[PDB]
Structure 1
């Protein structure tokens, strides 16, 4: 199962790891994708997860959007995890770079509570533009299920652990 994680709280764990490499190693029940409302997996975590599936995630996502329309910011959908996990929980955190309400980050993390254990990135962090320290705080204060956070950047991982209240 999950190895090398630092325990932050009763249910939140963190590791400096590439979430794609982590998913291929663990093959968890649920891998969280840092999705956008259109499920267009172009860059950041979404582009990396999609590239690991040889674009199968994008093909499946386009069929999902054709049938259902876009997700809401703060919302999610469960799709296949392909070669990475049993399922992928595509969660839309607010993109601060697209002027979205950072207050929707708590709503985005609430989606994690529908799954007993998840491998996940910090929502709205990276190319989504939010402060990752704030994202970790919202995560620990919102998620009650077991969440294994993979932080790609070593320097950001160190800052997150060393500043964790």
Structure 2
């Protein structure tokens, strides 16, 4: 199962890890992707997860968008986890670099509550432009299911742990 995690709360755990390497090692039931409404997995966690699937995630995602249209900011969809997990929960957090409402980050984390355990990144952090300390706070105050957070950047991981209330 999950190893080397620091316990933050009853249900939130955190580790300085590459989420792709973590997924390949654990092969969890659910890996969360930091998706955009179009499921265009270009950069950040999405680009890295998609690249690990040899673009199979993008092919599947384009078929999903052709049938269903775009997701909502704060919304999600469950697709295949390919070689990384049983399922991938594509969750759209607000992108602050696109003027999206930061209040939608709580709605985005509510999607995690439909899954008993998840491997996930911090929503809206990184190239999405939100403060990762705020994202972790919304995560622990919103998610009630077991979430194992993978934070790629060591310096950010240390800052998140040392500032966690």
| TM-score normalised by L of structure 2 | 1.00
- How far residue 37 of structure 1 moved from its aligned partner, in angstroms, is 0.0
Q: How does 1:1-165 map to 2 (within 5 A)?
A: 1-165=1-165
What root-mean-square deviation, in Å, do the aligned CA atoms of Structure 1 and Structure 2 show? 0.1
Deviation for aligned residue 1:34: 0.1
Report Cα offsets for 1:95-154 as digits up to 9, x if no partner: 000000000000000000000000000000000000000000000000000000000000
Runs of 4+ in 1 over 4 A off after TM superposition: none
Q: C-alpha deviations, 1:27-63, integer Å up to 9, x for none?
A: 0000000000000000000000000000000000000
How far does residue 155 in structure 1 lie from its aligned partner after superposition? Answer: 0.1
Gaps of 5+ in 2: none
CA distance in 2, matches of 1:151, 1:23: 13
Output the CA distance in 2 between the equivalents of 1:163 and 1:63: 42
Aligned partner of residue 2 in structure 1, secondary structure: coil
Unaligned runs of 5+ in 1: none
Q: Give the Cα–Cα distance (whole angstroms) in 1 for the partners of residues 97 and 16 of structure 2.
A: 24
* Count of matched residue pairs: 165
Quote the Cα distance in structure 1 between the aligned partners of 2:73 and 2:145.
21
3-state SS of paired residue (1:109): helix
Question: Secondary structure at 1:148's aligned position in 2?
Answer: strand
